[PDB]
């Protein structure tokens, strides 16, 4: 009914990742991959893991698709100016 936030590209996540990451993921090695989050801090993985799992690049393991929750803010489209442009009110009988 109301969809705004949740709104990640795969792609805009992937060039928006360091060679590494984007090395990584053309290696399939999920291993590899999860092994560089154990040396980055806490903070920076979930934001990182939140980005695959919300833009749906990456699979990473099960029970976990469709990140929920999050400060929600809007999909930006109010589309207003100060005139009605237009609409299906027909000429009446036509």
């Given at each position: 009914?109301?969809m705004?936030?949740?709104?990640?590209?795969?792609?805009?996540?992937?060039?928006?990742?360091?060679?590494?990451?984007?090395?990584?993921f053309?290696?399939?090695?999920?291993?590899?991959?999860?092994?560089?989050?154990?040396?980055?801090?806490?903070?920076?993985?979930?934001?990182?893991?939140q980005?695959?799992?919300?833009?749906?690049?990456?699979?990473?393991?099960?029970?976990?698709?469709?990140?929920?929750?999050?400060?929600?803010?809007?999909?930006?489209?109010?589309?207003?100016?100060?005139?009605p442009?237009?609409?299906?009110?027909?000429?009446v009988?036509?």
């Open positions: 009914g109301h705004g936030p949740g709104g990640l590209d795969p792609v805009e996540v992937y060039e928006s990742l360091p060679e590494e990451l984007q090395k990584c053309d290696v399939k090695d999920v291993q590899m991959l999860q092994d560089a989050i154990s040396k980055m801090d806490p903070t920076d993985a979930k934001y990182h893991m980005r695959c799992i919300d833009s749906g690049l990456w699979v990473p393991n099960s029970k976990a698709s469709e990140a929920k929750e999050g400060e929600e803010a809007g999909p930006g489209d109010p589309l207003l100016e100060a005139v442009k237009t609409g299906d009110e027909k000429d009988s036509v």
